[PDB]
């Protein structure tokens, strides 16, 4: 019944996967061994003959290090060994190595494992793909896998949770190249993609959680909370829900304009105890503050095409509508002329769950706003400009060419990005 398969690619994807699955277990009362003493959780967890609950997920990395930590870790019994796939040689922050050279060896094995999970599904909805834009595996292997998934799965829904690179935490000079190459190749294969800018997450951890030097552990716990908010509607049956198809129908007006901006609230530090309880009005107001965004950009300089508000916990429809009405009186929120109905609201009964010993405080109510704004084009522009700086001099190009890539693939990828930026511009013009 309505199953969803989660694929975690590369270090970023695997590490975010660890955070997501830890949070899902806390939310559904599943122990780290898969034991549990609704029924919708079955969309994400299958059940074995021993009454154990197993994530409907595949973890893939071209290097074994990251995944070796999962198979030694607290949740080693949660996953069956066959769903934790590792190679020997990494993609060395090279899209060409991930996509071609190294990727081509493991691709068939990864798809065989995905096929085995799909065979356990009676009503497979589709896939959730987690990866970084910057790493060779996250970029190169993901686009290779996405292409192969379109072939094997027909017209099956594929949603992404993409880690947009940040210099505060960046590991490679070539991340703009890998980002553009993966976006070009994956664009025609993805139905909806939620970008997560590591700088936005880094700044929220610093500002809201008072963490001087945020680590991936800090970043992922926060990321996991947003992913859980998007997936709560699939894993639970509330008063107001949204399936794989309804997300896309409400937020995606055109094929290529499939990049919603996520905004989450409240993000409160586990200290204090006075900084709560926030009302529905207060958390809704926080969604329109650029400081709570998952991608750095300015919506006041762009136009909205769709706004989805996903509430969780002690929330009443009357409270929500009152909050939306006051926000509508703040003229500053501009929508495209071809869009009337701006607000689609969903309420899921379960209050946000937090990891014990975590940085996040337990709240009675939270909200995740998914908005399709033309302001997200600003994130593409930043990436495209960094690509252009290096590409004008063909700096580092030899690394890709050496692996069998052609220079033409770089031109093609960049022209496609130029067309994407042009698409966001065309969409914001009035008729």
């Amino acid at each position: 019944m309505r199953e969803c398969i989660s694929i975690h690619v590369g270090q970023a994807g695997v590490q975010i996967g660890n955070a997501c699955w830890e949070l899902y277990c806390l939310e559904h009362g599943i122990q780290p061994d898969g034991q549990m003493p609704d029924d919708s959780f079955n969309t994400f967890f299958s059940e074995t003959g021993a009454g154990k609950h197993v994530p409907r997920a595949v973890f893939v990395d071209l290097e074994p290090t990251v995944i070796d930590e999962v198979r030694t870790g607290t949740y080693r019994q949660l996953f069956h060994p066959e769903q934790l796939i590792t190679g020997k040689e990494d993609a060395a922050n090279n899209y060409a190595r991930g996509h071609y050279t190294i990727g081509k060896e493991i691709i068939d094995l990864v798809l065989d494992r995905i096929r085995k999970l799909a065979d356990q599904c009676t009503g497979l909805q589709g896939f959730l793909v987690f990866h970084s834009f910057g790493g060779g595996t996250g970029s190169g292997f993901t686009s290779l896998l996405m292409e192969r998934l379109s072939v094997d799965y027909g017209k099956k829904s594929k949603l992404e949770f993409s880690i947009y690179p940040a210099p505060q935490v960046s590991t490679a000079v070539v991340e703009p190249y890998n980002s553009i190459l993966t976006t070009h190749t994956t664009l025609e294969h993805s139905d909806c993609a939620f970008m997560v800018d590591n700088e936005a997450i880094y700044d929220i951890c610093r500002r809201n959680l008072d963490i001087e030097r945020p680590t991936y552990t800090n970043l992922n716990r926060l990321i996991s909370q947003i992913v859980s908010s998007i997936t709560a509607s699939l894993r639970f049956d509330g008063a107001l829900n949204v399936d794989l198809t309804e997300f896309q129908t409400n937020l995606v007006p055109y094929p290529r304009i499939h990049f919603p901006l996520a905004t989450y609230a409240p993000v409160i530090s586990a200290e204090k105890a006075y900084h709560e309880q926030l009302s529905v009005a207060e958390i809704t107001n926080a969604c329109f503050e650029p400081a709570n965004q998952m991608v750095k950009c300015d919506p006041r300089h762009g136009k909205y095409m769709a706004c989805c508000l996903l509430y969780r916990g002690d929330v009443v429809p009357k409270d929500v509508n009152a909050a939306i009405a006051t926000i509508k009186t703040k003229r500053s929120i501009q929508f495209v002329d071809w869009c009337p109905t701006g607000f689609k609201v969903g309420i899921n009964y379960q209050p946000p769950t937090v990891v014990p010993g975590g940085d996040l405080a337990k709240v009675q109510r939270a909200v995740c706003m998914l908005s399709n704004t033309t302001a997200i084009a600003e994130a593409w522009a930043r990436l495209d400009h960094k690509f252009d700086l290096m590409y004008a001099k063909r700096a580092f190009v030899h690394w890709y060419v050496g692996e069998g890539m052609e220079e033409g693939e770089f031109s093609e990828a960049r022209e496609d990005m130029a067309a994407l930026e042009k698409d966001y511009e065309e969409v914001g013009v009035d008729s």
Partner: protein
């Protein structure tokens, strides 16, 4: 990506290589018998990058020791950590190279090369996932220089997809054992431009100047110079041998450091500067460590970084310090010294911090820079070369080995092109 195969060639190569192994063994808590006696799990986490685990608790360097002369090998075996090395891994000739690149590259070296490749193949086929090779040698001699570059070419033939890394020591008139060093160096530079993925340009001119001027050692010995080499080698390899995010393997380092194939010559830097005896010392804070990145006084290549521009920089901080302070200080230096970093390579300075400091120091900093100022080192070699070549002085030593004048003209022209290439990117602008 796991194992690195280390090769030591010639007098200099073996001397520096032996010191590298005693330094890193001490850091990884390995005694001269191969037994681990440390008390930190970080020491063993990535031990497999440089050591093979032999039967039981013992660790053996994945090192091949090469020379055309037997004496140096005997000196290594006799040494402090001499017993740690794999007996079968010592490959030595009887007929030396006599500080003649032609003997090392074409004659005597060619005769020994196959016996060396046989030992490197044994080590390589034992590997789960070979990253590549690391060669320590001098460019002024005959074995390290001529045979070393011959080995690079032969290894490249058999392992064309592995990373080729070198620690190449540049000759200097300040600490010269032969008048023909400019010829040997030029002939070797020609080979490295074409055959390595990354070369750490270790300049004896800079090492002598540091010892004499900074360490106040009136008469520096190779032991004094090698103490600086081993401190640098320990620093630049920190990322490969301890758990880390940045430049964790040879390929990732190369991919982040090398924008153009031929521009793979690194200018290493180190702070604080210490002398063998100096176990004092009481100094070095984070702002202090960071300031020495632009300090010509701290460069292992005799070039002023302020005479050029950095294409890419890797900076490794070691010891117990604030990661926040490091990030602030590093950003301050890039903002203050904007003009010494290329604008067309965004976020080109990458930093890593390792909790384990090197021996004797509580805090240290290692810099790996890909700077256009490295052209000063190559210009120096070209002018020394031309002064001799103009008069065809000592050419009989090379032609007598079967070499032709053209090879000399070609090596020189290739090296001048390399200088011209650094100058081209020094003058390049982000006008796009």
């Amino acid at each position: 990506m796991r194992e690195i195969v280390h090769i030591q060639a010639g007098q200099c190569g073996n001397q520096i290589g032996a010191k590298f192994w005693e330094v890193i063994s001490d850091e990884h808590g390995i005694d001269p018998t191969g037994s681990y006696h440390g008390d930190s799990d970080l020491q063993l986490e990535r031990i497999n990058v440089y050591y093979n685990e032999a039967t039981g608790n013992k660790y053996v360097p994945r090192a091949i020791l090469v020379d055309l002369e037997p004496g140096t090998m005997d000196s290594v075996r006799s040494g402090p950590f001499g017993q740690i090395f794999r007996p079968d891994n010592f490959v030595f000739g009887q007929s030396g190279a006599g500080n003649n690149w032609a003997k090392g590259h074409y004659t005597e070296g060619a005769e020994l090369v196959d016996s060396v490749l046989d030992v490197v193949r044994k080590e390589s086929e034992s590997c789960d996932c070979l990253q590549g090779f690391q060669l320590t040698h001098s460019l002024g001699g005959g074995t390290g220089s001529g045979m070393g570059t011959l080995l690079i070419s032969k290894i490249r033939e058999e392992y064309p997809d592995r990373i080729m890394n070198t620690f190449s020591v540049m000759p200097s008139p300040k600490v010269s054992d032969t008048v023909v060093e400019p010829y040997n160096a030029t002939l070797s530079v020609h080979q490295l431009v074409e055959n390595t993925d990354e070369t750490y340009s270790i300049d004896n001119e800079a090492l002598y100047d540091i010892c004499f001027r900074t360490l106040k050692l009136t008469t520096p010995t190779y032991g004094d110079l090698n103490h600086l080499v081993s401190a640098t080698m320990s620093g630049v390899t920190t990322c490969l041998r301890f758990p880390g995010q940045l430049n964790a393997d040879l390929r990732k380092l190369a991919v982040n450091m090398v924008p153009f194939p031929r521009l793979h010559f690194f200018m290493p830097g180190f702070a604080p500067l210490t002398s063998r005896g100096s176990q004092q010392y009481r100094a070095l804070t984070v702002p202090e460590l960071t300031q020495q990145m632009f300090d010509s006084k701290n460069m292992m290549a005799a070039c002023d970084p302020r005479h050029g521009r950095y294409l890419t920089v890797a900076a490794i901080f070691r010891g117990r310090m604030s990661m926040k302070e490091v990030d602030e200080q590093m950003l301050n230096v890039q903002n203050k010294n904007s003009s010494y970093f290329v604008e067309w390579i965004p976020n080109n300075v990458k930093t890593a911090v390792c909790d384990i400091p090197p021996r004797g120091l509580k805090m240290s900093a290692t810099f790996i820079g890909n700077s256009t100022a490295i052209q000063e080192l190559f210009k120096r070699i070209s002018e020394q070369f031309t002064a001799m070549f103009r008069r065809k002085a000592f050419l009989h030593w090379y032609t007598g080995e079967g070499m032709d004048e053209m090879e000399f003209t070609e090596a020189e022209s290739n090296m001048n092109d390399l200088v011209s290439e650094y100058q081209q990117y020094q003058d390049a602008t982000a006008d796009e």
